[PDB]
Amino acid sequence: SSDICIVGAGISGLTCASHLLDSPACRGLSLRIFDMQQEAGGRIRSKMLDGKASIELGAGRYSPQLHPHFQSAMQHYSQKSEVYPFTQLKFKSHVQQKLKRAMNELSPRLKEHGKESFLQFVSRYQGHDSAVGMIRSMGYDALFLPDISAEMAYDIVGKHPEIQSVTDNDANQWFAAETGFAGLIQGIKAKVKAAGARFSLGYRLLSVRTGDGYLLQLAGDDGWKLEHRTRHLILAIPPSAMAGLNVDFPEAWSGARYGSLPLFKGFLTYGEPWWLDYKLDDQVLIVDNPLRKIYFKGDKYLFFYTDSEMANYWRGCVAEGEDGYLEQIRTHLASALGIVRERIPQPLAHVHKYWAHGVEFCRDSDIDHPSALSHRDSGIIACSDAYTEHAGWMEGGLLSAREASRLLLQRIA
């Protein structure tokens, strides 16, 4: 039993625990934190690649100009930052060199047609084939989706490091975590455990019922069933996960609608840093082939990152088998570089991760969305980056946690 239960130990849930435990109104309230995974962190998943480097299977970068709360958290918990180098395109295609003017040329038309999908918007002025080639040249297949408006696309482009110069946001600086953002998740976790929160990792919330308070049915990843009673409940899970529980989401919560799209990253190490030769170190290529964005980190490893249908494409390759997945990568590396396949070596060790719901966000609405939500009848609070204007970014988790904890403090009344 607890007074306060948080389900979700991503950055959102852990940060809620932190604000709550920082407050005098929470003195003497026991706090329980569940997560279905065996480690805290959610979409922040740092990993050692074959003992050679720390890589980010999930969130990988931030900007102090866009993400001031996150920057403040990194400093607070004493995490070392290094420069994220992938902030420009050193090897632009001809289409990519036209991007800035092309985009600038269309911007005033956002007034009249900015609510339609970016693909239709661009197509309205350039026709289909040219719109396709231009949009594809920015490397985020999200920009092809029907539920990404032209206004949303301009926003997206200005906030991603590889293409921020297209909308003239080159001033924004970007950083990564020298030892992984998991170190921040560990630092928050250590702080909340030190203040008395109790962690139950490995349990998946299946359903919730109200009488004075709440009764939760959870299942352990080894089969162990658990029931837990709390007086106050924050579900620090994304919209997709909310939809799996029996709490009538979103009708009973906001009635807003939430989009979702998958993500994929693959990291590969090589015997020789063969890309040094071509001056690719610390650079990113954005290409039309299914690798889409190819990043070469120093002389240590390379990786690629894709979304939406290309993420599903890569996951399907993996399902067929390692060998064909690796060979497909080699074929697309050779095409991207314009050199012959046998000149791309075979990798030494690699890792990959597919996120079925890597990004979740509020769909374009005329209703303002609050940063955290509560259930009409039950007073259950819902916390996620998806509910903020930084949907898709750790910053939106911090923003949502601030509001969720504020709301819980006010319910505690």
By beta-carbon proximity to a second copy, the closer residue of 80 and 198 is 198
Annotate each residue in 39-68 with x if it binds ligand FAD (CB under 6 A) or - if it does not, as one string.
---xxx-------------xxxxx------
Apex 188 CA angle, 174 and 37, nearest 5:
95
* Residue 197 annotated as lining a ligand binding site: no
The correct pick among 4, 6, 13, 180 for binding ligand FAD (CB under 6 A) is 13
DSSP string, 6-70: EE--SHHHHHHHHHHHHSGGGTT--EEEEESSSSS-TT--EEESTTS-EEESS---B-TTT-HHH
397 binds, among a second copy, ligand FAD, none (CB under 5 to 8 A by kind): ligand FAD
Cβ 322 to ligand FAD, closest distance in Å? 19
- Contacts with ligand FAD: how many residues (CB under 6 A)? 37
* Residue 394 annotated as lining a ligand binding site: yes
8 Å CB contact between 307 and 140? yes
Under the criterion CB under 6 A, does residue 150 sit at the interface with ligand FAD? no
8 Å CB contact between 64 and 81? no
220 binds, among a second copy, ligand FAD, none (CB under 5 to 8 A by kind): a second copy
Neighbours of 400 (CB within 10 A): 28
Residue 408, classed as helix, strand or coil, is: helix
By beta-carbon proximity to a second copy, the closer residue of 176 and 311 is 311
353/356 Cα distance (integer angstroms): 10
Q: Of all helices (H) and strands (E), which one includes residue 159?
A: helix 150-159
Under the criterion CB under 6 A, does residue 259 sit at the interface with ligand FAD? no
8 Å CB contact between 59 and 181? yes
37/204 Cα distance (integer angstroms): 8
Would you call 260 exposed, middle or buried from its count of C-beta atoms within 10 A (0-12, 13-18, 19+)?
middle
Under the criterion CB under 6 A, does residue 265 sit at the interface with ligand FAD? yes
Q: Would you tell me which residues interact with a second copy (CB under 8 A)?
A: 198, 200, 220, 222-224, 226, 315-316, 319-321, 353-357
Under the criterion CB under 6 A, does residue 233 sit at the interface with ligand FAD? no
Residue positions in the annotated binding site?
Answer: 10, 12-13, 35, 43, 61, 160, 205, 236, 305, 394
**Site residues (CB under 6 A) for ligand FAD?**
7-13, 34-37, 42-44, 58-62, 204-205, 236-238, 241, 263, 265, 355, 358, 384-385, 392-397
